Amino acid sequence: KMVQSNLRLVVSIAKKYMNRGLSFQDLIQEGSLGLIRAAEKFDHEKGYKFSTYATWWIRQAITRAIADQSRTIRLPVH
DNA sequence: TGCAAAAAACGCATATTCTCTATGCAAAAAACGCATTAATACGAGAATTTTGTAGCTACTTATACAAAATTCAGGAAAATTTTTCTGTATAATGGGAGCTGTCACGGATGCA
Fold it and tell me: How far is residue A73's CA from residue A78's CA, in Å, rounded to a whole number?
C-alpha cells in the first residue's frame, strides 16, 4: 500500500528524465523498480521520508536503466 | 600607166684548183718463239703421336635412426582498463499537441 501510495511524486523523475530516448512510461516503470527499492532499504527511525532517500534510489535506478537502456547499442557507462 | 628597150648583170661558153679520196712508208708496238731457271709439287722415310680401350681408384653420394639445436601453440598468472552493481538522505504531490478544407464506399453499430 505504502508502495502504491508513494506513486505520485515519481512523475518528478519522469519529467526530469522525460523518456531518456525511451518512453515516459518506461521511464517511470523502471522508476517503480526503484520504489520497492526504496521501501526495503528505506530507513525507518531516520529523521525524514525517503523524499530525500526514496528519490535517491529512484533517480539512481532510472538512470542506470535509461542508459542501460536505449540506443540499440548498449553502452558502457565509461 | 600600157612598154619598148638599154646596160649592166646574169646566165652558157672553160680555165684553175683546190679540198680532196686515194696507197705505199716506216716506226715502234706486240706477241711469239727460243728458251732458261726456279718453283710447285710428287717420293720416300720413319717420327711423332692422338685417339681409342682397359682396369683401378678416389670422390661422391644413396640411404636409414632420430631427437640435433630451435619454433611454436596453448595454459595460466598479471595489468590495466572497463563494466556492472550498489550506494550517496530538506521539500519537491494529475501530461502536451496537433485534428478540425478531400471524394466516395461498405459495413457496423446506436437510438429512438
Answer: 14
Technique that determined the structure: cryo-EM
A78 touches strand B (CB under 7 A): yes
State whether residue A46 is helix, strand or coil: coil
Resolution of the coordinates, Å:
4.5
For residue A5, give every residue at least 6 positions away whose Cβ sits within 8 Å of its Cβ, in sequence order, or none: none
Q: Which nucleotide is nearest to A46 (CA to C1')?
A: B89
Element of type H or E holding A54: helix A54-68
Q: How many residues does chain A have?
A: 78
